[PDB]
Amino acid sequence: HMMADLVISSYGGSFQDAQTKAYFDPYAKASGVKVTGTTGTGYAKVKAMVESGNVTWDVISAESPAFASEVKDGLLEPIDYSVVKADNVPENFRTKYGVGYMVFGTNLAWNKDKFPNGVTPAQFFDPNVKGRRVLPSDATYSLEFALMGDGVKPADLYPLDVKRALKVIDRVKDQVIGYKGASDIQALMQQGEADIVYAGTGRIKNAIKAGANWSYSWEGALADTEYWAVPKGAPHAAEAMKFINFAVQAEPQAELTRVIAYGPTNVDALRLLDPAVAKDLPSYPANAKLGAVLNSKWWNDNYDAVKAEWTTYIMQHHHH
Numbered sequence: 001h002m003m004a005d006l007v008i009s010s011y012g013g014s015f016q017d018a019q020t021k022a023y024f025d026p027y028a029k030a031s032g033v034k035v036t037g038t039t040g041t042g043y044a045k046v047k048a049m050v051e052s053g054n055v056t057w058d059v060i061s062a063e064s065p066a067f068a069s070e071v072k073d074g075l076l077e078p079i080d081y082s083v084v085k086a087d088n089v090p091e092n093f094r095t096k097y098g099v100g101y102m103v104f105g106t107n108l109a110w111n112k113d114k115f116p117n118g119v120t121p122a123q124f125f126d127p128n129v130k131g132r133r134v135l136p137s138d139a140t141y142s143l144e145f146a147l148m149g150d151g152v153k154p155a156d157l158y159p160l161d162v163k164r165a166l167k168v169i170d171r172v173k174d175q176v177i178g179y180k181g182a183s184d185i186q187a188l189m190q191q192g193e194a195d196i197v198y199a200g201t202g203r204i205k206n207a208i209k210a211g212a213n214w215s216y217s218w219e220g221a222l223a224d225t226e227y228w229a230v231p232k233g234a235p236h237a238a239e240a241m242k243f244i245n246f247a248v249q250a251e252p253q254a255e256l257t258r259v260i261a262y263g264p265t266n267v268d269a270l271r272l273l274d275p276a277v278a279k280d281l282p283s284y285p286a287n288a289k290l291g292a293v294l295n296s297k298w299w300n301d302n303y304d305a306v307k308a309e310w311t312t313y314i315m316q317h318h319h320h
């Protein structure tokens with residue numbers, strides 16, 4: 001039998017399928033190493049894993065607030081830049097402990113069979129608008145969307161008014177059917193068991209490709225960066241750096257954006273992409289101006305406090 005030579009932790013579902021097609025399988029073919037994708041990535045699981053000393057993840061995909069909390073707790077190995085060679089990825093994305101490989105939007109989407117006319121962020125947070133709502137599982141993304149739904153202009157979000165954001169969620173808590181992960185949200189859209197959600201653009205667009213009659217907008221959307229990183233104690237840290245080097249190249253980056261509606265950080269992947277793909281990405285001006293970019297520094301400074309309040313809030317008000 002063959003034990004995985006490289007275990008990569010991600011978010012499952014259609015996004016993990018897209019990473020498998022663009023990154024994992026092409027790396028496995030090129031290196032002759034078995035690449036196995038798994039789920040569960042996040043600060044809590046990376047922290048528990050690294051501190052136990054029983055590290056089974058070689059590479060993680062970390063969204064920027066999770067990446068910040070992981071760097072803060074010293075849970076990651078410094079990236080080997082003598083191995084990771086992608087000068088096409090701008091300097092800001094090439095950090096000490098991680099390489100930003102993707103830009104993704106989180107958007108308001110609605111079931112066209114319930115809302116043929118669409119829904120605005122203010123309507124999502126209006127109790128008079130009836131529909132089964134799904135929010136994200138953590139406070140990240142959720143709070144920014146609530147504030148923009150309450151009239152905070154996207155450019156004015158930070159520092160977040162956490163008390164206000166929670167009162168805004170509270171207005172519609174009785175119609176929220178879950179605080180969920182991405183794969184669970186796409187499943188609810190496809191089954192037609194939700195009416196309005198806030199989810200990654202790629203998840204929404206893949207649900208539509210699968211036949212879900214939904215639409216979405218960039219109003220009140222939040223953009224963020226995803227990083228590749230290596231947990232401290234990774235059994236195959238050198239293999240992990242070679243995978244990261246491979247994955248951040250223009251061709252694998254272009255393939256990812258071709259399969260799912262998330263953007264590359266490799267500026268050279270834009271040279272390889274058809275111009276029409278640009279209009280569905282978070283950086284496209286028409287899209288960017290209607291929402292905001294997640295402020296990783298604010299989350300770095302406030303995540304622990306916000307997380308304790310969010311966990312208390314969700315434990316008290318969850319009803320499904």
Ligand SMILES: O=C(O)[C@@H]1C=CC(=O)N1C[C@@H](O)[C@@H](O)[C@H](O)[C@H](O)CO
Nearest residue numbers: 011015063104136137138181182200
């Ligand atoms: O899996 C996805 O397609 C997207 C794309 C990158 C990413 O971090 N994703 C997950 C987030 O949209 C989101 O589900 C987040 O992990 C949760 O809200 C918990 O913070």
